[PDB]
Design an enzyme around this catalytic site. Structure first.
Site, PDB file in Angstrom:
ATOM      1  N   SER B 109      -3.744 121.583  10.768  1.00  0.00           N
ATOM      2  CA  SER B 109      -2.444 121.974  10.220  1.00  0.00           C
ATOM      3  C   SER B 109      -2.072 123.422  10.543  1.00  0.00           C
ATOM      4  O   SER B 109      -0.900 123.783  10.444  1.00  0.00           O
ATOM      5  CB  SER B 109      -2.388 121.764   8.736  1.00  0.00           C
ATOM      6  OG  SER B 109      -3.140 122.782   8.108  1.00  0.00           O
ATOM      7  N   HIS B 158      -1.487 128.078   7.265  1.00  0.00           N
ATOM      8  CA  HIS B 158      -0.116 127.608   7.174  1.00  0.00           C
ATOM      9  C   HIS B 158       0.897 128.652   7.629  1.00  0.00           C
ATOM     10  O   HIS B 158       1.788 128.349   8.417  1.00  0.00           O
ATOM     11  CB  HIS B 158       0.175 127.215   5.728  1.00  0.00           C
ATOM     12  CG  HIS B 158      -0.263 125.830   5.418  1.00  0.00           C
ATOM     13  ND1 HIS B 158      -0.088 125.266   4.172  1.00  0.00           N
ATOM     14  CD2 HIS B 158      -0.844 124.895   6.201  1.00  0.00           C
ATOM     15  CE1 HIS B 158      -0.559 124.042   4.200  1.00  0.00           C
ATOM     16  NE2 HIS B 158      -1.030 123.785   5.433  1.00  0.00           N
TER      17      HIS B 158
END
Lengths: 4, 176
Positions: B109, B158
């Site tokens: 991610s 992130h």
């Protein structure tokens, strides 16, 4: 533990 | 759907299978970001953290996003562009996640958020590239970040990924  | 898109989906499934046979921890010891300065010359670890996933739903979720967006970059901008987005974003999202919370983290991610950042900005500033992110997904992306602030996520990964993907997209939308 952490989710990337 | 081309060579780099599939090579990475195979790597993540191969490593995921090994985590089920060997256990999470055993794989983590060898693939995670260096926890000890003495290990700093174990080159692979700066990248390998990105291949490790901890449940089936996160591996699914991640590889699917990698397919949709990574496949779009490779199709339109070529394999070398997706390689460079992947290597830079994995290294830097790793580096930031380590500072925020230490070296025990994994997943794609980091790279995914750099892909969402690059595909969105590139498709707004250089539409002719042939890639774009729907506004329905730039809302899902932003809700995903903020739902990590208020909570099991790697928040540093992130936001460092996303930033990397805006940076690169911006630079590439001058050279165009």
């Amino acid at each position: 533990v952490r989710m990337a | 759907a081309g060579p780099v898109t599939w090579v990475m989906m195979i790597a993540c499934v191969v490593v995921f299978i090994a985590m089920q046979i060997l256990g999470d921890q055993e794989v983590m010891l060898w693939l995670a970001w260096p926890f000890d300065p003495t290990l700093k010359f174990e080159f692979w670890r700066y990248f390998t953290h990105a291949l490790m996933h901890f449940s089936l739903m996160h591996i699914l979720f991640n590889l699917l996003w990698w397919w949709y967006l990574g496949g779009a970059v490779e199709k339109r901008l070529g394999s070398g562009k997706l390689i460079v987005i992947t290597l830079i974003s994995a290294l830097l999202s790793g580096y930031v996640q380590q500072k925020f919370s230490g070296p025990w983290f994994g997943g794609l991610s980091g790279v995914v958020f750099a892909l969402m950042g690059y595909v969105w900005l590139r498709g707004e500033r250089d539409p002719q590239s042939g890639i774009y992110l729907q506004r329905g997904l730039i809302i899902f992306a932003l809700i995903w970040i903020v739902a990590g602030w208020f909570d099991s996520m790697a928040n540093g990964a992130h936001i460092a990924g996303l930033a990397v993907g805006l940076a690169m997209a911006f630079v590439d939308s001058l050279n165009a």
